[PDB]
Amino acid sequence: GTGVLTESNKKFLPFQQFGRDIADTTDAVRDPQTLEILDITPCSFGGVSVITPGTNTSNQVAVLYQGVNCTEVPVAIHADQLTPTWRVYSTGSNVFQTRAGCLIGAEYVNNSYECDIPIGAGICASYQTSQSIIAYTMSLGAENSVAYSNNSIAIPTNFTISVTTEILPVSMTKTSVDCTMYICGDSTECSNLLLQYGSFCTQLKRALTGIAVEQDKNTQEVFAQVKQIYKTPPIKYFGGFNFSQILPDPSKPSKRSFIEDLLFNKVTLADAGFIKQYGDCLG
Amino acid sequence: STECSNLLLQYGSFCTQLKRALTGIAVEQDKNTQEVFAQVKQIYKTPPI
Amino acid sequence: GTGVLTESNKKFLPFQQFGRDIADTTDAVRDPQTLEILDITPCSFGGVSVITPGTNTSNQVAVLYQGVNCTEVPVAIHADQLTPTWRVYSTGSNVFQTR
Amino acid sequence: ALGKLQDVVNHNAQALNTLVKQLSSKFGAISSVLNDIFSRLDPPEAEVQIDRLITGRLQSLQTYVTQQLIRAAEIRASANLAATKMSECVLGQSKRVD
Amino acid sequence: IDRLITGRLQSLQTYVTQQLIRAAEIRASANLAATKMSECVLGQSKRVD
Amino acid sequence: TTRTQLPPAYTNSFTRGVYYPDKVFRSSVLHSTQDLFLPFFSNVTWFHVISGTNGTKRFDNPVLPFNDGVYFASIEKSNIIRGWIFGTTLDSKTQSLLIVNNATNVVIKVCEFQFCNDPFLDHKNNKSMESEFRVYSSANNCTFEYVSQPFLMDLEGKQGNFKNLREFVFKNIDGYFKIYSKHTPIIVREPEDLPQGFSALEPLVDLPIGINITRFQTLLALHRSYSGWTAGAAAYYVGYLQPRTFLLKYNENGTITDAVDCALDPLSETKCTLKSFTVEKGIYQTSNFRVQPTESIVRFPNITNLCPFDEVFNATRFAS
Amino acid sequence: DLICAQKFKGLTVLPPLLTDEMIAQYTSALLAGTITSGWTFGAGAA
Numbered sequence: 001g002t003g004v005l006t007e008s009n010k011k012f013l014p015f016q017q018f019g020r021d022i023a024d025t026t027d028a029v030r031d032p033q034t035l036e037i038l039d040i041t042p043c044s045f046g047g048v049s050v051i052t053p054g055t056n057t058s059n060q061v062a063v064l065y066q067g068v069n070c071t072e073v074p075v076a077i078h079a080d081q082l083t084p085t086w087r088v089y090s091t092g093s094n095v096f097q098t099r100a101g102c103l104i105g106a107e108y109v110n111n112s113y114e115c116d117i118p119i120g121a122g123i124c125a126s127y128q129t130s131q132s133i134i135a136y137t138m139s140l141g142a143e144n145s146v147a148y149s150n151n152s153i154a155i156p157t158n159f160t161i162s163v164t165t166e167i168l169p170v171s172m173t174k175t176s177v178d179c180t181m182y183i184c185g186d187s188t189e190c191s192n193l194l195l196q197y198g199s200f201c202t203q204l205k206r207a208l209t210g211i212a213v214e215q216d217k218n219t220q221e222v223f224a225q226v227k228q229i230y231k232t233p234p235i236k237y238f239g240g241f242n243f244s245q246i247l248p249d250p251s252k253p254s255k256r257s258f259i260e261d262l263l264f265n266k267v268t269l270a271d272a273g274f275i276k277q278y279g280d281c282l283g
Numbered sequence: 284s285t286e287c288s289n290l291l292l293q294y295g296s297f298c299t300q301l302k303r304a305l306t307g308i309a310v311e312q313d314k315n316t317q318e319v320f321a322q323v324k325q326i327y328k329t330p331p332i
Numbered sequence: 333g334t335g336v337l338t339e340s341n342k343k344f345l346p347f348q349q350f351g352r353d354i355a356d357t358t359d360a361v362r363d364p365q366t367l368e369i370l371d372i373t374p375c376s377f378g379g380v381s382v383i384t385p386g387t388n389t390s391n392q393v394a395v396l397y398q399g400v401n402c403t404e405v406p407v408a409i410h411a412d413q414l415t416p417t418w419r420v421y422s423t424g425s426n427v428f429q430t431r
Numbered sequence: 432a433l434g435k436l437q438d439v440v441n442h443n444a445q446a447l448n449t450l451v452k453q454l455s456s457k458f459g460a461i462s463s464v465l466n467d468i469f470s471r472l473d474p475p476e477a478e479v480q481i482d483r484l485i486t487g488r489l490q491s492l493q494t495y496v497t498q499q500l501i502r503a504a505e506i507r508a509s510a511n512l513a514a515t516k517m518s519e520c521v522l523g524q525s526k527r528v529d
Numbered sequence: 530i531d532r533l534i535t536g537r538l539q540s541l542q543t544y545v546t547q548q549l550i551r552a553a554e555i556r557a558s559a560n561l562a563a564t565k566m567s568e569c570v571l572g573q574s575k576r577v578d
Numbered sequence: 579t580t581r582t583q584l585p586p587a588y589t590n591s592f593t594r595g596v597y598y599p600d601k602v603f604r605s606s607v608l609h610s611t612q613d614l615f616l617p618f619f620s621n622v623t624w625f626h627v628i629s630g631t632n633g634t635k636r637f638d639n640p641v642l643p644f645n646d647g648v649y650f651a652s653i654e655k656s657n658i659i660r661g662w663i664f665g666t667t668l669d670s671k672t673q674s675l676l677i678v679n680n681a682t683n684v685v686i687k688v689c690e691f692q693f694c695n696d697p698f699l700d701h702k703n704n705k706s707m708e709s710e711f712r713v714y715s716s717a718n719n720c721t722f723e724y725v726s727q728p729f730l731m732d733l734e735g736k737q738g739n740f741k742n743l744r745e746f747v748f749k750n751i752d753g754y755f756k757i758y759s760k761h762t763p764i765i766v767r768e769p770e771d772l773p774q775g776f777s778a779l780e781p782l783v784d785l786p787i788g789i790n791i792t793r794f795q796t797l798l799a800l801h802r803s804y805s806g807w808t809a810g811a812a813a814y815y816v817g818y819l820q821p822r823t824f825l826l827k828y829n830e831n832g833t834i835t836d837a838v839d840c841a842l843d844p845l846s847e848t849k850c851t852l853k854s855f856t857v858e859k860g861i862y863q864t865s866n867f868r869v870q871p872t873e874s875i876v877r878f879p880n881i882t883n884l885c886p887f888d889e890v891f892n893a894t895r896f897a898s
Numbered sequence: 899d900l901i902c903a904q905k906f907k908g909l910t911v912l913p914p915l916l917t918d919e920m921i922a923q924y925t926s927a928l929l930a931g932t933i934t935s936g937w938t939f940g941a942g943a944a
């Protein structure tokens with residue numbers, strides 16, 4: 001075993017030696033030589049989180065210790081602990097005691113901003129001006145007051161037309177798996193051994209087929225809603241309103257608007273749906 | 284148990300996905316409150332009367 | 333192992349012997365005989381789907397081979413890629429290549 | 432701002448990559464190659480030696496299928512919301528606030 | 530040791546799966562609450578009940 | 579001779595001391611390995627051999643402990659540094675290594691032989707031959723011999739203005755001995771420090787003797803005065819080797835472009851656990867910490883009377 | 899003597915990002931807005 005031994009008050013019976021808890025583990029023990037009772041508890045541990053502004057900006061980092069006091073558990077011991085190579089003593093960079101734990105490497109200021117990197121319990125950190133890592137308390141918003149009165153009202157005179165976008169996912173990639181090749185690659189004996197398990201692969205294929213059909217049904221419900229295919233007249237004058245950036249252009253081989261092209265080009269930074277690939281991939 | 288840690292390393296990545304799922308759950312938990320309550324960009328005050 | 337051995341252009345160093353891939357698969361090997369760098373690529377395969385109009389009406393069916401080009405794997409190959417006796421007629425219909 | 436659509440692709444790619452990387456797991460066996468086990472050992476213990484790998488890979492497949500099933504429900508919810516928004520905003524005027 | 534390791538991994542996986550399943554319905558309830566807050570407090574709704 | 583002691587110097591190791599761990603070719607993959615490696619930014623000894631006191635021999639060749647491995651390197655110009663003899667106790671009663679570099683033969687010998695006070699070699703050929711064999715008198719028991727091409731293929735300094743940067747990693751494990759090397763010229767030498775550049779060390783030979791090695795010694799190749807014995811200017815470095823976890827990055831061709839330590843600073847192992855060299859803004863969870871035990875406690879009851887085991891076993895008659 | 903038993907087996911709880919006071923402030927702001935403005939503050943300036 002390994003733990004911290006202290007005195008205990010559990011009055012053992014004459015024949016009882018060990019002790020257990022609800023956690024089905026040993027918790028108390030009697031010394032083999034002297035008739036003393038001792039309790040077993042593991043020594044301190046915890047978790048470590050690293051806060052960084054990103055390698056593209058700077059290499060400075062801030063280290064957060066979770067659920068420990070700055071001084072009660074000073075992981076700053078001579079040297080050899082877990083993650084031994086770090087020292088991060090940094091008494092110069094003031095250690096800030098947060099609700100989550102001890103934050104070492106950041107400076108605490110009497111300010112308020114938006115939350116850039118969430119730490120916990122209303123404390124956020126950001127890389128701000130020379131340049132260093134700071135910690136503060138997030139600000140809910142700008143203060144305001146409304147001039148309420150028994151007889152007072154405000155009426156607008158001007159209007160603003162606003163256009164905002166909204167993106168919603170619809171479907172995901174349809175995939176299928178093969179049991180025999182994935183589990184036992186090129187082994188008849190392994191397949192024969194698998195045969196003794198019965199059917200643990202009908203369920204997987206059934207679930208994946210259901211998912212694929214579900215995806216197709218989702219797309220059909222979302223888009224297929226009109227029974228006719230209308231066309232706009234060749235003249236594109238609508239009361240002075242200009243719709244040239246969303247109506248399709250017949251000139252392009254693919255009947256897609258400019259904004260649709262921008263969306264496709266933006267999303268194509270990652271396209272794993274290479275259906276066009278075939279068995280010709282033997283290069 | 285130092286040797287049990289070495290033995291567990293032979294089981295591949297059975298701890299990365301668990302941690303990722305738990306972190307995703309925590310982030311979604313924060314996002315729920317952020318969406319429900321943070322609906323106004325101004326902090327109004329009631330008149331003294 | 334089983335695979336299709338083809339010429340390779342891997343820049344093997346003199347001490348290097350065995351090649352690998354992204355996921356622990358040996359896609360290259362060095363000849364114990366006269367030195368030659370060689371690739372390994374697993375042999376062709378795919379899934380099979382059966383299309384039917386209903387046992388109630390007719391018995392004629394159509395077979396779709398999933399994700400394989402028609403040219404290199406037709407039904408006229410004597411190799412009998414599993415399902416030996418299970419052969420649709422060579423030109424039962426003009427074989428159609430779909431996505 | 433297209434993070435919602437990027438997250439789906441990223442999650443699917445990462446899950447598939449983890450599934451294909453899982454094949455290197457020893458699962459307590461002496462080696463991760465079936466052919467080596469067959470060539471070096473007789474069947475009497477090779478049966479259990481390959482059985483351990485069978486159990487590990489089956490568990491991995493089950494986990495992947497469960498994750499896909501869980502994600503399908505969220506995708507369905509998003510699709511239903513999108514269909515409702517289409518029907519209530521594009522085809523008419525909505526009095527609902529926000 | 531392998532038997533115990535497999536058993537404990539099974540327990541952890543079951544726990545994670547149940548947590549995700551619960552998080553799904555919590556998300557649904559949070560979305561409903563946000564919609565109700567945006568429609569009933571910030572305006573007047575003609576939807577019955 | 580009656581040379582005086584020289585206080586050792588120190589230098590920053592920078593990002594040097596990485597070798598190919600296995601024979602397997604891998605391309606376009608970020609493979610992580612656990613093996614013996616040189617920590618980044620580590621102190622390295624700066625033994626410097628030169629004509630001391632303008633004509634006094636300097637014996638700057640202590641019996642350095644071998645421990646777990648070395649990172650012998652040099653900025654040598656001409657062929658002056660040779661010999662990497664080893665010895666557990668350094669006497670005639672202990673098996674030892676001998677790596678000479680005469681002409682074009684390594685002549686690897688594993689024999690028991692007496693060691694000179696200050697063994698040395700003659701770079702110039704004793705004309706007429708070379709008693710270069712002054713390092714020892716004779717070898718009475720020989721076990722292993724090996725002759726091949728010299729371990730260095732570096733071209734001679736020629737006109738000059740460029741010197742060699744021979745690097746060597748010696749590792750002994752499970753009765754095996756492996757040697758790795760890599761050479762490259764040097765541009766500027768004003769501060770006389772290892773340049774900040776990445777180098778990959780390929781294997782060159784495998785040696786299977788299971789010799790026990792605890793101390794390390796090096797030799798010099800100086801012929802005579804050109805009073806006493808004198809030579810030119812040279813410098814070599816020694817770096818001890820300790821276990822570490824590294825993350826390697828192969829290229830399309832299959833050569834290591836760069837690597838990152840997984841224990842240096844929190845950013846390093848954050849990159850390690852993210853399996854990428856680029857980290858975006860955010861907060862990440864990396865690992866955990868605890869306190870290791872400091873003492874061992876063994877408490878048993880104190881009794882001394884032996885069990886009567888002989889009665890049970892050494893009995894004249896056994897029951898039915 | 900219940901949280902420590904779980905903590906000794908690596909089962910922790912992380913604190914929420916938003917404390918109770920900020921949520922109370924949001925609720926008070928919404929109440930004041932809907933009292934002194936009506937529904938106009940939900941689609942522009944109050």
Ligand SMILES: *[C@@H]1O[C@H](CO)[C@@H](O[C@@H]2O[C@H](CO)[C@@H](O)[C@H](O)[C@H]2NC(C)=O)[C@H](O)[C@H]1NC(C)=O
Nearest residue numbers: 146147148149150151152153329330331332934
């Ligand atoms: C608005 O009217 C109210 C009520 O008339 C005023 O509040 C006080 O109400 C009490 C009880 O009804 C009266 O006895 C007081 O006389 C009211 N105050 C005053 C100043 O008359 C409130 O003050 C009024 N506010 C304004 C801005 O006129």
Ligand SMILES: *[C@@H]1O[C@H](CO)[C@@H](O[C@@H]2O[C@H](CO)[C@@H](O)[C@H](O)[C@H]2NC(C)=O)[C@H](O)[C@H]1NC(C)=O
Nearest residue numbers: 155156157158159160161162163240241942943
């Ligand atoms: C009401 O507000 C709108 C705000 O856009 C006014 O439109 C602007 O008026 C100013 C007056 O100097 C012009 O300089 C701007 O060019 C106008 N905007 C545009 C887009 O042209 C509008 O005039 C105001 N009054 C009315 C009666 O609508």
Ligand SMILES: *[C@@H]1O[C@H](CO)[C@@H](O[C@@H]2O[C@H](CO)[C@@H](O)[C@H](O)[C@H]2NC(C)=O)[C@H](O)[C@H]1NC(C)=O
Nearest residue numbers: 236237238239240241242243244245246249258
């Ligand atoms: C509708 O908007 C489009 C936006 O592209 C207008 O097309 C631009 O017109 C300007 C006129 O000065 C040209 O300089 C641009 O090169 C045009 N852009 C493209 C992509 O062709 C179009 O003129 C607008 N039509 C109306 C009736 O307002």
Ligand SMILES: *[C@@H]1O[C@H](CO)[C@@H](O[C@@H]2O[C@H](CO)[C@@H](O)[C@H](O)[C@H]2NC(C)=O)[C@H](O)[C@H]1NC(C)=O
Nearest residue numbers: 341342343344828829830831832833834835836
């Ligand atoms: C990889 O190997 C190639 C071939 O030996 C090296 O040489 C150049 O590679 C590039 C492709 O990156 C070609 O366009 C050039 O034609 C090749 N030759 C020359 C003289 O440049 C290449 O330097 C090696 N390293 C990398 C990173 O590609």
Ligand SMILES: *[C@@H]1O[C@H](CO)[C@@H](O)[C@H](O)[C@H]1NC(C)=O
Nearest residue numbers: 032033034035878879880881
């Ligand atoms: C161990 O020895 C000491 C001294 O002889 C004695 O006092 C003690 O009782 C012994 N232990 C036990 C369990 O009797």
Ligand SMILES: *[C@@H]1O[C@H](CO)[C@@H](O)[C@H](O)[C@H]1NC(C)=O
Nearest residue numbers: 096107108109110111136137
């Ligand atoms: C504000 O700054 C002062 C120093 O000027 C410091 O003493 C004080 O603690 C800060 N406020 C808080 C809440 O920490």
Ligand SMILES: *[C@@H]1O[C@H](CO)[C@@H](O)[C@H](O)[C@H]1NC(C)=O
Nearest residue numbers: 362363364365366367368369
């Ligand atoms: C035998 O192996 C050697 C090795 O390269 C090769 O050159 C030779 O052609 C092979 N066959 C014979 C008959 O020597």
Ligand SMILES: *[C@@H]1O[C@H](CO)[C@@H](O)[C@H](O)[C@H]1NC(C)=O
Nearest residue numbers: 384385386387388389390391
């Ligand atoms: C389908 O089969 C049933 C029974 O086999 C039969 O009664 C029915 O008429 C069939 N349907 C058609 C369209 O023939």
Ligand SMILES: *[C@@H]1O[C@H](CO)[C@@H](O)[C@H](O)[C@H]1NC(C)=O
Nearest residue numbers: 278280400401402403404429
């Ligand atoms: C199938 O193979 C033939 C011949 O190799 C080729 O011409 C054709 O383009 C291929 N079809 C596809 C879809 O790759």
Ligand SMILES: *[C@@H]1O[C@H](CO)[C@@H](O)[C@H](O)[C@H]1NC(C)=O
Nearest residue numbers: 579580581693694695696697
């Ligand atoms: C040993 O050291 C002495 C210096 O006291 C030196 O004169 C002698 O030459 C050395 N031994 C040999 C064999 O050179």
Ligand SMILES: *[C@@H]1O[C@H](CO)[C@@H](O)[C@H](O)[C@H]1NC(C)=O
Nearest residue numbers: 669670671672690717718719
């Ligand atoms: C060689 O000399 C060593 C050292 O005296 C001795 O241990 C060994 O037995 C000798 N070997 C012979 C004489 O074969």
Ligand SMILES: *[C@@H]1O[C@H](CO)[C@@H](O)[C@H](O)[C@H]1NC(C)=O
Nearest residue numbers: 679680681682683684685725
């Ligand atoms: C180096 O010395 C060895 C000692 O026997 C000799 O056999 C070898 O030929 C020498 N190398 C030369 C002369 O290139």
